[PDB]
Design a protein around this ligand. Structure first.
Ligand SMILES: CCCCCCCCCCCCCCCCCC(=O)O[C@@H](COC(=O)CCCCCCCCCCCCCCC)COP(=O)(O)OCCN
Ligand SMILES: NC(=O)C1=CN([C@@H]2O[C@H](COP(=O)(O)OP(=O)(O)OC[C@H]3O[C@@H](n4cnc5c(N)ncnc54)[C@H](OP(=O)(O)O)[C@@H]3O)[C@@H](O)[C@H]2O)C=CC1
Ligand code: SF4
Ligand code: SF4
Ligand code: SF4
Ligand SMILES: [Zn+2]
Lengths: 122, 153, 382, 178, 328, 129, 24, 103, 39, 71, 71, 101, 177
């Protein structure tokens, strides 16, 4: 706890009756409080980064279960993530310095700024 | 030491990130999605965001919908009368970039042509949570300000 | 005395830029300024195929999305002669009517928030965020569900959508009652609305109102009873028609039209035939993913329907449905090619917002936002 | 159709259709006179100008085709009187009959350029204020001529310079064999 | 340069500039010229990321790339000038700040950017911007520093253009905007030295148009210290006469002898002493700006003027001063 | 006895039959000024004669409506007065007759339209009562 | 001002459907 | 306004009418947009006349009608504060091309 | 009708080519011929 | 590769060309194969029938998978 | 195709294809209310006036007795 | 004492609603594409709708034809007139079904 | 007429113990206290709100969010460069350039979706023959700068490999439609 400075207190006021369904690699604890009441508020995630958290830290294995699109906890879709090309999440580093943010291939901030001139000069 | 400066920046940023009232230039549907992001389910009054109806006192300006070439001067005139610690959020494809109407003669190719933008909520009809996450990214942009440390150079 | 009455509350009426020529507090003329939301829709559609043209329609009226896709689809089936199944018609109405509810839930309580009642807005928007759990579930996007395609409808309902629409319709009479108990009885409401923007029927006809502003005045004219364009000739529902024409009749209609739309939803649910979802004519309806991959002749059509298009034959028709705003009709001249040719979009709000000039004459300046309320003026269509 | 028997033959001058909504492609001179008929008539009572659709055929000689739609709330029928007026032919305005025609004709003049006779307040409704050019024509390029608008040292002002953008990619989907 | 376009705002001009002083009053016009004639601009900012936000527009999607850099730390200046062929230098101060002294902000930086551009062989044109009359033995320590900056940018890097703009007028300037908001001391304008100063202001748009014109020029304008003077050689009092024409106010000047001013600006000159508090940027009364105000050397001599750039400056009446209307 | 027309603005007229007789006699008298061999005059004469006849025969407004199945007598008066306006207008800018060239191209496209498309259905016949 | 004031009196609420309730 | 231009004479008459209108309206133009100091009335009259003369070779009457209509539109949007002022101040050999582009 | 058309001056001195697009050599089908286009 | 050096600047994750050139060719029985996609004929590419008359493996154009006769 | 996408092992014929899609359960849904059921079971016109008048009749007597005690 | 006649008891908070989350395939839908009679009988020109239409018959009327028609139209007897769309208003509170649809 | 309409609409409620009923409703707010009572019932009822970052709104496998170029289980980008999505795109966001790679099988040298110039209508997901381009349910990719929002040629749309675990699930559950 010790955060009376966030809405994280609203999540920690949840979890009082909720059951913990799995926890992904990053530490985000995925909770479920069904049966009681208030559909739409019976699946959430405790981000395990009580500060500096934001959305999109929820990996794709769980981002289904947590938006109610599926009923497969990330401990069940982890047997379906492709091993050959599977890639870990990236938290959406939007703005947090260059080389973390994404860059196109001509942005002059991207190492290896490609030239698009279709004609090959002499 | 510098620690006092670090904490006074943390405090200023906590203020400007807690109470960030946007002048919601709700043009078009992304204003209907913004109204859903102001509605009961995804509260914006929870995060402090209070939709101001006037440009005079507003920390932000969530331009949404198709910025028309005729509503470009009005958007600029509204942006020029916000108090200096202001930010702009582009919500929807039509507001952030050219969008469905990139090649329309009457549509500016993204408000990035009129006002300087700080967070582009992506998705042409952004989910109400997506605009909410765009605002939770504007909150990060505040938390990376440290204006006092820069005033001390 | 000229006053540049702009958008009082932004994010509700976005680009409203009236220029009121007042007389003290009495308005002498209201001159609306259009074009602030004039995206090049009636030009951009001439440049794209009949499939690429459909997403503009959900973006024409932003509070009642699928009604315009349903008005466009019925204008590229009027030409194509593309007979759609019974299930496509029933889904198409169950969503045109869910859209009537999605619009009246907004255009009532956004109006009721301009008048001043703050809570009906948020209750109706919880209801709308329940109906967008249907839009978003059946197509994908909560608002712009490019779902009512020309032939039939994009793709079948998920296997749990009628149960959820039922579990919503059971609890929706109560929400209308609350929106009604909070606004209909109030003396601060009636006072703010009775004898406001009264439109004699000759005026609602002259100015081509043709909506909930043509049934306020008492003209019994609903293009679901006049020109039944779907199962509407099978579905039972009573069109509420006002007797005075004041903005308090149009509100009472929009709050009854939100119950008859509930009747139509419950009927479309209780009688939805298990048939094909799109027209069997695979040269107007892209074949399913399963078929185009397995069948070579389906793959060719999936290629020439997602690149070339229909090439609907040469004609010119005005297909008008009863969108929530009013008679939304899309006059679709069609050169033989795969791209439309001057897909003109008659959109109510271009004819209604004309009415603001005579509706709000001699009304007080604070009424000029109530008029804009009951006209359901959404500037995407204007 | 009853409307064609009573109507003076000269008024339905050029054309007449019989499906997809019936139309009386008339002449521009007999238009508001033809719109006077079909309204204020006992057996043809339209009273409702639904729409005024400018349509531009560049390959014609009378380029535009001002398609007046008309609903008849009484007899439950819809007639589409049309016209044909090129870029410099002022066409009769029917704002005097159906006052809804005001904004529709402002839009027809704005988009196309078919000025309307004795139409009070015939002023560009949709396009920008300083807009030169008529968009919904055919020869008007999609991206517009000078229609980019950006902020600049002329502070608080968005200029209107010549336009430059990612080139609109026109795809030649149209296949032979129609 | 390798220009592939027609006008700008999507064209290319082969000028991937790094306008070192872009987040400043001169910088916003120069960046707009360079990025409206369609060329990349690598605007480097010093502190708050809100500094170059007004420059993310006026350039089309990466034509203006604001970058972070520390003025005293190299290996970051080299990173800002990594992909660049033009390097303009607008980094200058009119007031000493407790952290950066006059030399460490006017001379010891311009020399540093000059050296780290020399090392990064490929900077075709390096423009160096310093005030007019910034010659050694000038009273104002700002002009002595700005003269040493010219001498060190030419030595350490020859064929490097040097604009010499005189006090630049325009919106958000440091010459007229302090006088107004001091006319808001009830029309009381304290023209110092009695308005005997003779200085040639210039519309900042035209200083920018000259800074870009030495880029679009040929091999010439290299190592040739221009003097972007402007028209209508004025006097401080006479220039103030034109302000009161725009802002509706009645001329109510006073004369201040130079000792009185230098005593009134004796505070805010303990900048190096008052460590635990930064002073509020002396706007009108600046002991160094006053030392410059004394001698009217701010006049264009027979050195290169706008005429040697096919360019003629705008006047100082009408639009090039119409930013004062916002004070009426 | 009629309380009110549901339509707003169309005020209930007590003397419906009398003003209807007046208007239809005026119409029959004024239509004489158009050439006889014009479809407009045959139509006006025929329906004005039918409505004037049924208005003279029946007495109550309700029976006028019931036999003459054309809505309400207030809307009927609106129609008759608008018809008088049209006949007094048609006298001016006389469009009667056909000029020699008279090129009128009747165009018929018979493509069937799908049933589930807005098709203006006829509506109830005058057996509504 | 002689402008027509909005008289908040009217006829009592009676839901007025169309005649097609039972048999069109 | 009906196109009474059944001949170049009526069209020219209404051209002179529009010219007199614009000239007699120049006062408000100079007032609302503040050109009474940058531009002289002689110069604004010069510009209006150079406009009406630049398009004087129009043997078509209806084209002149439409030109006068566009001009009245421009004026009415300049008289009122519909358009701004920084354009009104602006509204008022082969080798040197070859060196710039290929077009 | 060039001046009333609002087209800017610099785009009415343009030099066009009024061709008729030949048949796409790849496909032997004449369903796109006879449609003259300004170029 | 060089084509893959135009869109991928990572150069640490194996290039898709190698990811498909390192999967072994699939033995089969007849002279024609299906390669409907991954496994589910509705989640793979349109079915592409490949000929195995040659001795070398015949790649599936859409998926890169390789098939050999296995006589 | 369309007989290889909807298999239903057996079926001997192109009809009797699976055809399992969403719809109302057998027997439809429950009868959904749409009318306005606003219960007017509150205090009547009287009982509200007589509670107010009764409170005035007794409570003002109590104000009087309290004024007597205070005096 | 309010809008709660044992009918608002249908409350908005559902708590058991979308019990089967959408992307969970408990039942695999089928969504028929084509009618069974049109699977192995793919003759199209009979089923065609785009192109299976009568051609446009645009024939000219000259003055002779229309004067012939005007002389042929002897009288406008009833049933040569367009029928009126008769629609009257009628007050009804909740009688359709009893408020239950 | 409005004068007589008023006289009659006030002579309808003109019988004692009905004038009293209406007087009491005006004298003591009755309709308004039914507004306050409903408002109170909602003041005490549970709140339909969602503390967003920790729990998010319900979606569906058909939800259209961040576009992702899928891959075949064995690497090999699924995107053969047919350009059908570049053709079907209403906003023309996708720019595809194709080159026969050295392996010989066609692939896109440039597959850049411009998300800002993109309407998220899912036409690309439908048009693509092999399901190469799909919309991942991400929808949370608000970017500080516009240039990042233009999704590069097959490199950032190649981040769908992270979202494949959810995209493969949504496709396995939607393919029945
Ligand atoms: C049942 C208990 C009611 C308690 C209500 C508490 C509400 C408090 C919070 C505020 C409520 C909302 C405020 C609304 C403001 C507008 C109120 C208003 O003015 O309403 C009407 C007037 O209402 C009032 O003035 C209410 C004040 C009540 C005071 C006492 C009334 C008579 C008391 C009789 C006493 C009987 C016994 C005395 C002798 C024995 C105005 O008339 P109209 O235009 O609405 O309609 C008729 C037009 N001619
Ligand atoms: N203003 C005038 O009237 C005149 C000015 N000039 C010269 O023109 C140039 C630009 O003028 P203007 O823009 O108005 O000047 P400013 O004083 O407004 O500063 C402009 C730029 O200089 C940067 N800068 C200044 N000092 C430092 C420092 N120590 N470290 C890093 N960056 C620094 C500023 O960064 P930041 O914004 O972060 O502080 C800003 O980007 C200067 O060389 C100036 O002396 C010429 C004639 C007179
Ligand atoms: S970007 Fe899309 S959702 Fe947003 S306003 Fe434009 S069309 Fe509407
Ligand atoms: S959803 Fe796909 S096809 Fe549609 S605009 Fe976006 S990228 Fe293009
Ligand atoms: S994403 Fe699909 S449509 Fe686009 S090139 Fe790849 S396979 Fe073709
Ligand atoms: Zn394969």
């Amino acid at each position: 706890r010790c955060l009376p400075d966030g809405n994280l207190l609203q999540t920690k006021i949840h979890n009082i009756g909720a059951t913990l369904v799995g926890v992904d690699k990053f530490g985000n604890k995925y909770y479920q409080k069904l049966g009681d009441t208030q559909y739409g508020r019976h699946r959430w995630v405790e981000y395990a980064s009580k500060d500096r958290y934001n959305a999109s830290q929820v990996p794709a294995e769980w981002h289904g279960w947590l938006h109610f699109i599926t009923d497969h906890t990330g401990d069940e879709l982890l047997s379906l993530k492709p091993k050959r090309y599977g890639l870990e999440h990236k938290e959406n580093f939007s703005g947090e310095g260059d080389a973390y943010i994404y860059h196109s291939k001509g942005h002059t901030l991207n190492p290896g700024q490609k030239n698009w001139t279709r004609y090959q000069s002499w | 030491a510098e620690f006092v400066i670090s904490k006074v920046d943390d405090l200023m940023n906590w203020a400007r990130t807690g109470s960030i009232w946007p002048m919601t230039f709700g043009l078009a549907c992304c204003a209907v999605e913004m109204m859903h992001t102001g509605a009961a389910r995804y509260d914006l009054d929870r995060f402090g965001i209070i939709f101001r109806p006037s440009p005079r006192q507003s920390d932000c300006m969530i331009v949404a919908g198709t910025l028309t070439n005729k509503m470009a001067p009005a958007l600029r005139k509204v942006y020029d009368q916000m108090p200096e610690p202001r930010w702009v959020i582009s919500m929807g494809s039509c507001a952030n970039g050219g969008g469905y109407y990139h090649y329309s003669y009457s549509v500016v190719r993204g408000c990035d042509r009129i006002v300087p933008v700080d967070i582009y909520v992506p998705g042409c009809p952004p989910t109400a949570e997506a605009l909410l996450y765009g605002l939770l990214q504007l909150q990060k942009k505040i938390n990376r300000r440290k204006d006092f440390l820069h005033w001390w150079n | 005395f000229t006053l540049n009455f702009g958008p009082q509350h932004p994010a509700a009426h976005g680009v409203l830029r009236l220029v009121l020529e007042m007389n003290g507090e009495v308005v002498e003329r209201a001159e609306p300024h259009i074009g602030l939301l004039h995206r090049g829709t009636e030009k951009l559609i001439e440049y794209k195929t009949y499939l690429q043209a459909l997403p503009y329609f959900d973006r024409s009226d932003y509070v009642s999305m699928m009604a315009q896709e349903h008005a466009y689809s019925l204008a590229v089936e009027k030409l194509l002669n593309c007979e759609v199944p019974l299930r496509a018609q029933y889904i198409r109405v169950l969503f045109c009517e869910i859209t009537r509810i999605l619009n009246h839930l907004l255009a009532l309580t956004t109006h009721a928030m301009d008048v001043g009642a703050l809570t009906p807005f948020l209750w109706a928007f919880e209801e709308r965020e329940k109906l967008l759990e249907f839009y978003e579930r059946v197509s994908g996007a909560r608002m712009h569900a490019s779902f009512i395609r020309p032939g039939g409808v994009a793709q079948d309902l998920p296997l749990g959508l009628c149960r959820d629409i039922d579990s919503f319709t059971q609890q929706f009479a109560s929400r209308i009652d609350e929106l009604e108990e909070m606004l209909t009885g109030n003396r601060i409401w009636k006072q703010r609305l009775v004898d406001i923007g009264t439109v004699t029927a000759q005026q609602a006809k002259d100015w081509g109102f043709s909506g909930v502003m043509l049934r306020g005045p008492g003209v019994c004219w609903d293009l679901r009873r006049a020109a039944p364009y779907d199962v509407y000739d099978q579905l039972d529902f009573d069109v509420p028609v006002g007797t005075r024409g004041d903005c308090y009749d149009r509100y009472c209609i929009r709050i009854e039209e939100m119950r008859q739309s509930l009747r139509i939803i419950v009927q479309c649910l209780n009688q939805m035939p298990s048939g094909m979802i799109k027209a069997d004519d695979r040269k107007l309806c892209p074949p399913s993913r399963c078929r185009m991959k397995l069948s070579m002749e389906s793959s060719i059509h999936h290629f020439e329907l997602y690149t070339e298009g229909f090439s609907v034959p040469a004609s010119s028709t005005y297909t008008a449905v009863e969108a929530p705003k009013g008679e939304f009709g899309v006059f679709l001249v069609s050169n033989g090619s795969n791209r439309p040719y001057r897909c003109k979009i008659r959109a109510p709000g271009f004819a209604h917002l004309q009415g603001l000039d005579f509706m709000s004459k001699h009304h007080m300046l604070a009424d000029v936002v109530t008029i804009i309320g009951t006209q359901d003026i959404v500037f995407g269509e204007v | 159709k009853y409307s064609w028997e009573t109507l003076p033959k000269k008024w339905v001058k050029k054309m007449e259709r019989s499906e997809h909504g019936n139309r009386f492609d008339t002449n521009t001179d007999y238009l508001f006179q033809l719109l006077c008929f079909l309204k204020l008539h006992t057996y043809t009572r339209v009273q409702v100008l639904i729409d005024i659709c400018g349509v531009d055929y560049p390959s014609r000689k009378r380029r535009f085709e001002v398609v007046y739609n008309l609903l008849s709330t009484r007899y439950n029928s819809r007639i589409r009187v049309q016209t044909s007026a090129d870029e410099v032919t002022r066409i009769s305005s029917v704002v005097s009959l159906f006052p809804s025609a005001g904004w529709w004709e402002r839009e027809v003049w704005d988009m196309f350029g078919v000025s309307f006779i004795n139409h009070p307040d015939l002023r560009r409704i949709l396009t920008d204020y300083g807009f030169e050019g008529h968009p919904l024509r055919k020869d008007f390029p999609l991206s517009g001529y000078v229609q980019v608008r950006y902020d600049d040292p002329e502070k608080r002002v968005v200029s209107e310079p010549i336009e430059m953008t990612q080139e609109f990619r026109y795809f030649d989907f149209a296949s032979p064999w129609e | 340069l390798a220009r592939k376009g027609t006008g700008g705002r999507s064209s290319v001009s082969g000028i991937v500039a790094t306008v070192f002083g872009a987040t400043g009053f001169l910088g916003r016009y120069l960046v707009q010229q360079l990025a409206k004639m369609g060329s990349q601009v690598l605007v480097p900012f010093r502190g708050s990321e809100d500094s170059p936000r007004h420059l993310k527009l006026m350039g089309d999607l990466g034509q203006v790339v604001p970058m972070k850099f520390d003025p005293r730390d190299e290996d970051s200046i080299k990173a800002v000038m990594a992909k660049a062929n033009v390097v303009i230098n607008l980094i200058g101060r009119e007031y000493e700040t407790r952290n950066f002294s006059f030399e460490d902000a006017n001379h010891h930086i311009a020399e540093k950017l000059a050296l780290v551009a020399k090392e990064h062989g490929g900077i075709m044109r390096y423009i160096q911007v310093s005030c007019l009359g910034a010659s050694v033995s000038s009273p104002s320590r700002m002009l002595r520093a700005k003269a040493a900056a010219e001498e060190a940018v030419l030595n350490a890097l020859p064929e490097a253009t040097i604009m010499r703009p005189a006090t630049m007028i325009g919106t958000e300037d440091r010459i007229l905007n302090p006088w107004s908001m001091f006319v808001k001391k009830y029309g009381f304008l304290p023209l110092i030295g009695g308005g005997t100063t003779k200085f040639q202001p210039v519309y900042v748009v035209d200083v920018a148009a000259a800074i870009v014109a030495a880029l679009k020029d040929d091999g010439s304008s290299m190592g040739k210290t221009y003097e972007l003077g402007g028209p209508d050689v004025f006097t401080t009092h006479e220039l103030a006469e034109i302000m009161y024409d725009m802002i509706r106010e009645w001329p109510r000047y006073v004369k201040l002898p130079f000792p009185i001013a230098k005593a009134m600006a004796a505070p805010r000159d303990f900048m190096v002493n008052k460590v635990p508090f930064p002073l509020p940027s002396p706007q009108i009364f600046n002991l160094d700006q006053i030392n410059a105000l004394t001698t009217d050397t701010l006049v264009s001599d027979n050195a290169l003027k706008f005429q040697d750039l096919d360019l003629v400056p705008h006047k100082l009446k009408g639009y090039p001063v119409e930013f004062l209307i916002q004070y009426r | 006895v009629k309380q009110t027309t549901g339509i707003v603005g169309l005020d209930v007229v007590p003397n419906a039959r009398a003003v209807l007789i007046d208007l239809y006699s005026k119409t029959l008298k004024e239509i004489q000024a158009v050439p006889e061999d014009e479809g407009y005059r045959k139509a006006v004469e025929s329906f004005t004669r039918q409505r004037l006849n049924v208005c003279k025969e029946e007495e109550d407004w309700e029976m006028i409506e019931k036999r003459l199945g054309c809505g309400q007598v207030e809307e009927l008066i609106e129609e008759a007065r608008d018809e008088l306006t049209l006949i007094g207008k048609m006298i001016e800018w006389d469009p009667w007759g056909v000029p020699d060239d008279y090129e009128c191209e009747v165009i018929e496209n018979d493509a069937p339209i799908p049933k589930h498309v807005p098709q203006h259905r006829p509506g109830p016949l005058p057996e509504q009562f | 001002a002689a402008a027509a004031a909005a008289a908040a009196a009217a006829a009592a609420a009676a839901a007025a459907a169309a005649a097609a309730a039972a048999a069109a | 306004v009906p196109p009474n231009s059944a001949n170049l004479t009526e069209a020219r008459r209404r051209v002179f009418d529009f010219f007199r209108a614009a000239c007699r309206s120049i006062p408000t133009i100079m007032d609302i947009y503040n050109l009474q100091d940058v531009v002289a009335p002689s110069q604004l009259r010069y510009a209006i006349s150079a406009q009406i003369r630049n398009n004087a070779h129009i043997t078509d009457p209806k084209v002149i009608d439409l030109l006068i209509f566009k001009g009245m539109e421009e004026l009415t949007d300049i008289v009122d504060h519909a358009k701004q002022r920084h354009h009104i101040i602006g509204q008022y050999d082969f080798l040197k091309n070859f060196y710039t582009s290929n077009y | 009708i060039g001046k009333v058309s609002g087209i800017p001056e610099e785009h009415l001195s343009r030099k066009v080519i009024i061709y008729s697009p030949a048949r796409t050599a790849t496909q032997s089908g004449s369903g796109k011929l006879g449609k003259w286009k300004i170029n | 590769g060089n084509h893959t050096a135009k869109w991928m600047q990572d150069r640490s994750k194996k290039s898709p060309m190698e990811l498909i050139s390192e999967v072994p060719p699939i033995k089969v029985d007849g002279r024609i194969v299906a390669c409907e996609g991954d496994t589910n004929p509705a989640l793979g590419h349109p079915i592409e029938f490949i000929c195995l008359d040659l001795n070398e493996p015949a790649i599936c154009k859409y998926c890169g998978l390789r098939y050999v006769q296995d006589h | 195709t369309e007989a290889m996408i909807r298999n239903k092992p057996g079926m001997a014929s192109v009809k009797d294809m699976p055809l399992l899609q969403d719809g109302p359960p057998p027997g439809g849904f429950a009868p959904v209310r749409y009318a306005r059921r606003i219960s007017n079971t509150g205090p009547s016109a009287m009982a509200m006036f007589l509670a107010v008048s009764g409170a005035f009749a007794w409570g003002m007597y109590q104000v009087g007795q309290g004024n007597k005690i205070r005096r | 004492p309010c809008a709660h006649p044992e009918y608002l008891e249908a409350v908005p908070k559902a708590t058991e609603y979308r019990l089967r989350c959408p992307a969970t395939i408990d039942e695999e839908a089928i969504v028929p594409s084509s009618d069974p009679e049109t699977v192995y009988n793919i003759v199209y020109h009979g089923r065609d709708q785009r192109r299976n239409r009568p051609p446009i018959r645009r024939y000219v009327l000259t003055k002779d034809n229309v004067v012939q028609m005007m002389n042929e139209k002897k009288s406008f007897d009833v049933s040569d007139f367009p029928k009126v769309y008769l629609t009257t208003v009628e007050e009804d509170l909740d009688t359709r079904g009893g408020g239950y649809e | 007429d409005d004068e007589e309409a008023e006289q009659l609409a006030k002579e309808i409620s003109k019988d004692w113990s009905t004038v009293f009923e209406r007087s009491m409703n005006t004298l003591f707010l009755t309709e308004m206290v039914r507004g306050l009572s409903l408002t109170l019932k909602y003041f005490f009822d549970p709140k339909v709100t969602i503390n967003y970052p920790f729990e998010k709104g319900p979606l569906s496998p058909r939800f259209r969010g961040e576009h992702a170029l899928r891959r075949y289980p064995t690497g090999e980008e699924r995107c053969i460069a047919c350009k059908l999505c570049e053709a079907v795109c209403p906003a023309q966001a996708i720019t595809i350039e194709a080159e026969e790679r050295e392996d010989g099988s066609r692939r896109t040298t440039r597959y850049d979706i411009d998300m800002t110039k993109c309407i998220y209508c899912g036409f690309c997901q439908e048009a693509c023959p092999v399901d190469a381009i799909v919309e991942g349910p991400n929808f949370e990719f608000a970017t500080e700068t516009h240039e990042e929002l233009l999704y590069d040629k097959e490199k950032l749309l190649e981040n769908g490999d992270r979202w494949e675990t959810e995209i493969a699930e949504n496709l396995r559950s939607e393919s029945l439609y």
